[PDB]
Write a protein that binds this ligand. Sequence first.
Ligand SMILES: C/C(=C\Cc1c(C)c(O)c2ccccc2c1O)CCC[C@H](C)CCC[C@H](C)CCCC(C)C
Ligand SMILES: *[C@@H]1O[C@H](CO)[C@@H](O[C@@H]2O[C@H](CO)[C@@H](O)[C@H](O)[C@H]2NC(C)=O)[C@H](O)[C@H]1NC(C)=O
Ligand SMILES: *[C@@H]1O[C@H](CO)[C@@H](O[C@@H]2O[C@H](CO)[C@@H](O)[C@H](O)[C@H]2NC(C)=O)[C@H](O)[C@H]1NC(C)=O
Ligand SMILES: *[C@@H]1O[C@H](CO)[C@@H](O)[C@H](O)[C@H]1NC(C)=O
Ligand SMILES: *[C@@H]1O[C@H](CO)[C@@H](O)[C@H](O)[C@H]1NC(C)=O
Lengths: 698, 53
Amino acid sequence: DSRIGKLLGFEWTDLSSWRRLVTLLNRPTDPASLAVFRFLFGFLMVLDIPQERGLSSLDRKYLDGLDVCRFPLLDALRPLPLDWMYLVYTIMFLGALGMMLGLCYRISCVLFLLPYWYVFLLDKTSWNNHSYLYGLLAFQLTFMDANHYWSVDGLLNAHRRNAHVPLWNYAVLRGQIFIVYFIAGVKKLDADWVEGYSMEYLSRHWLFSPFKLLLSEELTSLLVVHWGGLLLDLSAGFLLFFDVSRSIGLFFVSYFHCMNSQLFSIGMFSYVMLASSPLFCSPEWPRKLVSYCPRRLQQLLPLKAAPQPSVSCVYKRSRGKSGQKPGLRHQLGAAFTLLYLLEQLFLPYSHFLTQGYNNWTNGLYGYSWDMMVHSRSHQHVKITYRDGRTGELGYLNPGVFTQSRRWKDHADMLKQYATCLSRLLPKYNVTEPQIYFDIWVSINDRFQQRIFDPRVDIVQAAWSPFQRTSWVQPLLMDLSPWRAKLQEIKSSLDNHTEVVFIADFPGLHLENFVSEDLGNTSIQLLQGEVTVELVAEQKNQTLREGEKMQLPAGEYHKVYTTSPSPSCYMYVYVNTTELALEQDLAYLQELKEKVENGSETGPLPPELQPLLEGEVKGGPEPTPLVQTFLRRQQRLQEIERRRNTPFHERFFRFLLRKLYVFRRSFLMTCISLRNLILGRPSLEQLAQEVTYANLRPF
Amino acid sequence: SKGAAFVSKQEASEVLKRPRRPRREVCELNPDCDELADHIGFQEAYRRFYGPV
Ligand SMILES: C/C(=C\Cc1c(C)c(O)c2ccccc2c1O)CCC[C@H](C)CCC[C@H](C)CCCC(C)C
Ligand SMILES: *[C@@H]1O[C@H](CO)[C@@H](O[C@@H]2O[C@H](CO)[C@@H](O)[C@H](O)[C@H]2NC(C)=O)[C@H](O)[C@H]1NC(C)=O
Ligand SMILES: *[C@@H]1O[C@H](CO)[C@@H](O[C@@H]2O[C@H](CO)[C@@H](O)[C@H](O)[C@H]2NC(C)=O)[C@H](O)[C@H]1NC(C)=O
Ligand SMILES: *[C@@H]1O[C@H](CO)[C@@H](O)[C@H](O)[C@H]1NC(C)=O
Ligand SMILES: *[C@@H]1O[C@H](CO)[C@@H](O)[C@H](O)[C@H]1NC(C)=O
């Protein structure tokens, strides 16, 4: 009767004692919306396993005999052989199907949960917010009685057919979605989001075309893209709860998720959030929807009758009987709800404890809900090794013995990579090495700067999870406002010239080798004091503010920083070989046009004849310039043909590609299950079956 | 120079290199990629496990 009781759904007096709280958190509630969400989540995970979890690509990620540097959270964990991995993914698929159909619900939830987290914890490079959310949702649904309506288990068991469920099943899910929205919103209260730096280039998508009718691009990239996301996060947190604002909240959230689905390649996360939005509605919407259909549909859709009493709820007895004393499962449910929501609130802000994982950002990516807030651009990665026997110094391929590229941003992954290199290099005639790393990275369009100390042997470096790393360079936030001026310098260049901005610590130096192609390269000092050394003649010159030097092309040079503070400078260079090739190609095209339009009546040179003919047959091999011209023309024609493609063909190719992925996954799984069960046949049969599996559907 | 793992001093020290052929790599997105076949020793391992494909 009270307005507060109507708005929030409970009275204050319900919270006066523990017993009343348990009764409130285990009141009867209709099961329909929970069942619909269970079905949708199961279907989306079933579609997601062969696509993003990597079942199709698993034959080339855990291949036996290959030497790879893994990145598991615990060093004890190691992958199983490939066949057992396919068995694990098969168990995942069966669990997802069981969750979707509601057949043996608890067993199916366990069979989906344990393998999913085994795969999740095995590799830190595949972590991301929408996989963590799927894991959490699978964890929650393991305990919820979501098979009480529209489930096969109901048909096989009368006691669980259209039965009541306790309220906390809905409360935990609503709390999870609210925490996602609110934590994402507050995490976006950052200087790089409110000022237009993160996601600066996404306003050019054609989906934002109508907004440009009333706003300029610079405002459209700030008011709509950035501030709109923050406001929608907070409001969609709050609006969906109350009855007054549910319709507008649903509309805005649906538009937001559809645009996120189209703009990004996040995957099934937009559809999962769309499926989670209706839960804030009344618990009985599927039942009234089923009621509002003709009788013929009602003979196939689920039941419409009122749900029956259950045993997992505390029932208030109005017959004069004493109220049902809460047992154990109700108290356990209430405690689980409270503790789980408290833990979910606390975990995103638990970065002051695990300081070993801290970096320029906070903690490992995946469980902070800071989506599309930081954008990184790497310039150079140099890996040096010194042999422990002869003393030779050598350089490694930067991405050697690795499958991801997130190790350039985390100290722990760097340490694991260093240990892997230490164990693996003795196969390549290298004794106990000392490995040094030199990585340059810029976050949100700042000066490119070192992230790790290049003078520290990472193999023998000290790292522990709960202590700050002493060999991670601080991020210079004092140089942030320069991002204004640098942008102006970016707009003052020609169509050929390019610019790279560098900031360096005192004491350190950068050694560089300008390639012979990059002629007419110059270095200019913006702030601080540096000295540029040419090693060809061993000559070093000290550069003050606003001074420019013309560097040699094809030689080594060094820049040393010799100021109390960090020094910022810039390389401005132009590629001479590409320019000369472009001029020659333009000249050749001009001669071709003169030949075609009737001018240049004189006989063509022999080297030009292949251009008119277009085919090298019965003649000398073409010169490199002719080959480049023909390749460019063919590429341009191919691109032009690709642009002129009707929509239906693109849709058909999309469907065929997806069908190919699904078929390949299924066939490889069947082959390996046969290998596990009946043993491994001869090599020729394996080759034949693998050839059959990879065949395109056509 | 003893295998694909190692590189020379010159190729290691070129800071001014063309990255693509546009970077701006944001997190989240979708981790999976088709570059896994460029690993060192892939062809031999694949031939041992799945035969002469
Ligand atoms: C890419 C954006 C946010 C990151 C993100 C993503 C990808 C998610 O999947 C989220 C899911 C749940 C919770 C938070 C998520 C999240 O943070 C901004 C995208 C902004 C969008 C393109 C702008 C258009 C919609 C706005 C709100 C319209 C407002 C109109 C005004 C006039 C009021
Ligand atoms: C060398 O590159 C510089 C930039 O590194 C270029 O200099 C430009 O030269 C034209 C000459 O008309 C000026 O208008 C531009 O303002 C200059 N650009 C600057 C200062 O950034 C030029 O492309 C190359 N110059 C030579 C002589 O080869
Ligand atoms: C040119 O000047 C630089 C500026 O320091 C010199 O760098 C120093 O070189 C000496 C050995 O010559 C080292 O012991 C110092 O540690 C270097 N300084 C720093 C800050 O690292 C460079 O050597 C000079 N080159 C010549 C040929 O004289
Ligand atoms: C050096 O490595 C090569 C290439 O792996 C190998 O053939 C050889 O055994 C090694 N040589 C010596 C002398 O150890
Ligand atoms: C410069 O241009 C040439 C043109 O052929 C190209 O091959 C090269 O990759 C470019 N970059 C460098 C660093 O030489």
